[PDB]
Amino acid sequence: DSSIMMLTSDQKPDVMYADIGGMDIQKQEVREAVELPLTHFELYKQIGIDPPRG
Amino acid sequence: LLRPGRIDRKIEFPPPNEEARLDILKIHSRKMNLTRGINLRKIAELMPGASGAEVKGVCTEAGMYALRERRVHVTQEDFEMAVAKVMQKDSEKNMSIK
Amino acid sequence: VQVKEQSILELGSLLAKTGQAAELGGLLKYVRPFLNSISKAKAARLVRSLLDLFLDMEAATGQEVELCLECIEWAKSEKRTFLRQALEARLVSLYFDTKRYQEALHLGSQLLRELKKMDDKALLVEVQLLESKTYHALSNLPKARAALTSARTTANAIYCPPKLQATLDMQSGIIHAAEEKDWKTAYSYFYEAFEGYDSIDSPKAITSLKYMLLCKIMLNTPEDVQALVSGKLALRYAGRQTEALKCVAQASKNRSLADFEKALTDYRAELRDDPIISTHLAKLYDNLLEQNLIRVIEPFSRVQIEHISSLIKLSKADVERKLSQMILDKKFHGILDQGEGVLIIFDEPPVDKTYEAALETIQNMSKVVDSLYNKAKKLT
Amino acid sequence: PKNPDLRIAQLRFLLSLPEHRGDAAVRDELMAAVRDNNMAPYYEALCKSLDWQIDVDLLNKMKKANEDELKRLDEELEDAEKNLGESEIRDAMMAKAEYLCRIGDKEGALTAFRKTYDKTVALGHRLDIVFYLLRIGLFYMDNDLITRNTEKAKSLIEEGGDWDRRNRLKVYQGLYCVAIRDFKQAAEL
Amino acid sequence: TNRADTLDPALLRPGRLDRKIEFPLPDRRQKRLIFSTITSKMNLSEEVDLEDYV
Amino acid sequence: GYSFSLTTFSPSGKLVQIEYALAAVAGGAPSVGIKAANGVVLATEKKQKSILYDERSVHKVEPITKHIGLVYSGMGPDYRVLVHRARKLAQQYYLVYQEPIPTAQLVQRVASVMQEYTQSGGVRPFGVSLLICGWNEGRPYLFQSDPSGAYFAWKATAMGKNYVNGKTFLEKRYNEDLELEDAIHTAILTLKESFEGQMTEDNIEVGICNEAGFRRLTPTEVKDYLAAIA
Incomplete structure (x- = not known):
């Protein structure tokens, strides 16, 4: 369990990535911090970066 | 707590010098693929008493510079921007007085 | 002397408005000891008001790059730093004018060694934005992103020579339209760029509308294309490129591919100014996808002459090598079913028990062959 | 140190097959x-x-x-x-x-x-010697010298993230395979 | 949160909460972007434009 | 819960009731002042709360003598008090020496007064930071003081809301060598960077200091100048 459990089943918060207004600072860096290292983990490997904590 | 018959060896922890910052730099950056023509003691002398927290942070910002390029290659220019990537303030005035 | 300093601009503006190249070129060759006579402060003003107002006259390529060489050789004869950097800038501008392949880069490598130590942080990006032009021109998209990032971190200090914030905004839109990922942002970039082009920069203002409305066609909101060519400043600077935008706009509004291709070919001289004809032929293509989708399900009701050649709105007879090209390059696994009347789209992708058993055998006997060493080793 | 010498190898090939000029071997060969x-x-x-x-x-x-x-x-x-x-x-x-x-x-x-080669204080001291075999291994299409020096580079010159002269290894193997019967090694490398 | 005062300034040592991002209040052209995005559902009476408000 | 009041030092830090007065200054109405080559330009930001108020009664830019201008960023009820003190004090100097007082001497004596109110222990400090200027002996000057009794010397500075943002624009925009009109242009630029949207001939209030003397401009020339100065 976690607040119900693990992204409480059906709940998209329904705020689009497109609904964000031009946050080319925010969206890019938050993307690199959370949205990217789940996908291109091997680049963090290949450069040996130890990705940022939070 | 501080009874010497209770604590028998109290060792201090200094923030490191140029050579030790160079060493910590080598430690973290050894797995980092650094290109060529890259000096490191210059980066160590760009550090005005770096504790070791931000010494790791310079290398992570260098890795982030390599990540924002779709590259795997790190120049010394990346560190030249990465040292610049750390500065905070504590600027305000009409407070010098003292 | 000082009263002749106005006659430099007087006779030179005469030779720029009404005179020709060789006379003003003789004037620039003539004022070379006069700058030696006068003081070296407003001499850069003389260099600007002569060279800029000479190279903005007319293309005569035997004199443009050659007088730029004259500026180089005299700047390396007099040997000062602050004058010759604008000469470097205008030279690499001339190199961009014909899209030069290596020498623009090989001069910008000489520019970067001199600017990032001096005082003018804006004079770096004054040519680095031109490098972002030539790397978008050669399509070095990552290095264009790098130059845009350097421009954005440079412009965080000073306001700029008056309309380059607008130029930075237009080329931020250029980089965001080179991705073809985010368009509303680039639209805002071009929009603020053209608002920075308000009544002061007309030849960039005219294609500012091209960029923003080409984006809004790319955005697939044709209603607002109509409403914003109906805007007041669009009607302040109306013309022929907006006629191209309006005809392509209505052709996209009603998706008439014939109207699209028709008014596309009608305005080819204005159609070059968008180098991305791929957005256009991708509205063609990316409309033709679902057109052949509603014309790949329409077959099985009452189909006609070939079922595979000319159900496609009967353009002439051979508007294809497009559908067949999308069986070729892409697929939706529609095999050429010429004489049926459905064009049946079928396969069974899960068969992978057999695949998986093959992938088993390949490594099962890698194991067996690795064990054979023990088997034929421990005996004899 | 090797650009006109690889151009001499280009001339070896260039006056290997054709005889349309019997005086390049005096012109740019004596200039070499x-x-x-x-x-x-x-x-x-x-x-x-x-x-x-x-x-x-x-x-x-x-x-x-x-x-x-x-x-x-x-x-x-x-x-x-x-x-x-x-x-x-x-x-x-x-x-x-x-x-x-x-x-x-x-x-x-x-x-x-x-x-x-007797002391090796750096893999550059090995690998410059390896390069000075690779130049002659392109000049004379050897196999023993210019695959066993690559074996030696695949012995100890894995260490050190210097990446220039480790990609040189990839380029030399690409050149060596495309120098014989390569499909995939030169594309991959 | 905007409150690093019941938060230890040892949480600002590089290694734990490293990425410093502070958001702009408004700015220009994200008035354009967000003035565009909020109008994705409200139906925009045909000339009541919003550049004036940018 | 300490410091409380004005008589005792902190355990290690400073005088919190002076720190709060400086914060109350920083929470005030913005201002900008620029020293150019020939003159000094002062400019404030004077918004009426309603549409009822008059712009001819209270004046922010204020002369102390015929050649010494003075603005503030804080509270008018204390501003007028220390204005009156500076008036009487400058006239005492001119009684003694029969010569117009130098601006440094004004700043010395005003700083002595403000310091005397920062002295113990029943009176509060001023919630006012000044910007003093004048054209004494050819070279013009620009002097900022503060509630703590200290004083400074600026080429260009700001005080009020977003003084940091205005200062980062001043560092970028301004330089050492301009004329008075370009100084007014960059001054209205840095006030227009931070002020409210309606900036008219009355929301600002600008006085200059030529070497020929102090001059307080009118809404006529302010409306002529700020008729879309850029």
Whole structure:
């Protein structure tokens, strides 16, 4: 369990990535911090970066 | 707590010098693929008493510079921007007085 | 002397408005000891008001790059730093004018060694934005992103020579339209760029509308294309490129591919100014996808002459090598079913028990062959 | 150190198959023979090319210049041991003996590399020697030299994230495979 | 949160909460972007434009 | 819960009731002042709360003598008090020496007064930071003081809301060598960077200091100048 459990089943918060207004600072860096290292983990490997904590 | 018959060896922890910052730099950056023509003691002398927290942070910002390029290659220019990537303030005035 | 300093601009503006190249070129060759006579402060003003107002006259390529060489050789004869950097800038501008392949880069490598130590942080990006032009021109998209990032971190200090914030905004839109990922942002970039082009920069203002409305066609909101060519400043600077935008706009509004291709070919001289004809032929293509989708399900009701050649709105007879090209390059696994009347789209992708058993055998006997060493080793 | 010499290899191929010009082997081959102290590039082409009109004397002066370089090497071998330093014999002859490899194909190579490989304080000290085999392994299409030096580079020169002369290894293997029957190695590398 | 005062300034040592991002209040052209995005559902009476408000 | 009041030092830090007065200054109405080559330009930001108020009664830019201008960023009820003190004090100097007082001497004496109110222990400090200027002996000057009794010397500075943002624009925009009109242009630029949207001939209030003397401009020339100065 976690607040119900693990992204409480059906709940998209329904705020689009497109609904964000031009946050080319925010969206890019938050993307690199959370949205990217789940996908291109091997680049963090290949450069040996130890990705940022939070 | 501080009874010497209770604590028998109290060792201090200094923030490191140029050579030790160079060493910590080598430690973290050894797995980092650094290109060529890259000096490191210059980066160590760009550090005005770096504790070791931000010494790791310079290398992570260098890795982030390599990540924002779709590259795997790190120049010394990346560190030249990465040292610049750390500065905070504590600027305000009409407070010098003292 | 000082009263002749106005006659430099007087006779030179005469030779720029009404005179020709060789006379003003003789004037620039003539004022070379006069700058030696006068003081070296407003001499850069003389260099600007002569060279800029000479190279903005007319293309005569035997004199443009050659007088730029004259500026180089005299700047390396007099040997000062602050004058010759604008000469470097205008030279690499001339190199961009014909899209030069290596020498623009090989001069910008000489520019970067001199600017990032001096005082003018804006004079770096004054040519680095031109490098972002030539790397978008050669399509070095990552290095264009790098130059845009350097421009954005440079412009965080000073306001700029008056309309380059607008130029930075237009080329931020250029980089965001080179991705073809985010368009509303680039639209805002071009929009603020053209608002920075308000009544002061007309030849960039005219294609500012091209960029923003080409984006809004790319955005697939044709209603607002109509409403914003109906805007007041669009009607302040109306013309022929907006006629191209309006005809392509209505052709996209009603998706008439014939109207699209028709008014596309009608305005080819204005159609070059968008180098991305791929957005256009991708509205063609990316409309033709679902057109052949509603014309790949329409077959099985009452189909006609070939079922595979000319159900496609009967353009002439051979508007294809497009559908067949999308069986070729892409697929939706529609095999050429010429004489049926459905064009049946079928396969069974899960068969992978057999695949998986093959992938088993390949490594099962890698194991067996690795064990054979023990088997034929421990005996004899 | 190797660009006109790989161009000499280009000339080896360029006057290997065609005979449409029987005087490139004097024009840019003598222009090569007057630079780089290229001795062997005419000493082996002395038979496969033309009669070489009288090509001993203008080459006598350059083999004499090579003799000057070689005799100051032969003095240098004991002049560097009087220099009270570490391995200065090895340094002071490895420099001009890699230059002997630049002069002569195999002889300076063999008399140099088996001494200047004896200490390896860096993998550059191995890999420059490996490069000075790779140049002649492109000149003469060897197999033993220019796959076993790559074996040696695939022995210890994995270490060090220097990446330039580790991608050189990838490029040399790509060149070596596409130099024979490659499908995929040159694309991948 | 905007409150690093019941938060230890040892949480600002590089290694734990490293990425410093502070958001702009408004700015220009994200008035354009967000003035565009909020109008994705409200139906925009045909000339009541919003550049004036940018 | 300490410091409280004005008589005792902190355990290690400073005088919190002076720190709060400086914070109350920083929470005030913005201002900008620029020293150019020939003159000094002062400019404030004077918003009426309603549409009812008059712009002819209270004046921010204020002369102390015929050649010494003075603005503030804080509270008017204390501003007028220390204005009156500076008036009477400058006239005492001119009684003694029969010569117009130098601006440094004004700043010395005003700083002595403000310091005397920062002295113990029943009176509060001023919630006012000044910007003093004048054209004494050819070279014009620009002097900022503070509630703590200290004083400074600026080429260009700001005080009020977003003084940091205005200062980062001043560092970028301004330089050492301009004329008075370009100084007014960059001054209205840095006030327009931070002020409210309606900036008219009355929301600002600008006085200059030529070497020919102090001059307080009118809404006539302010409306002529700020008729879209850029």
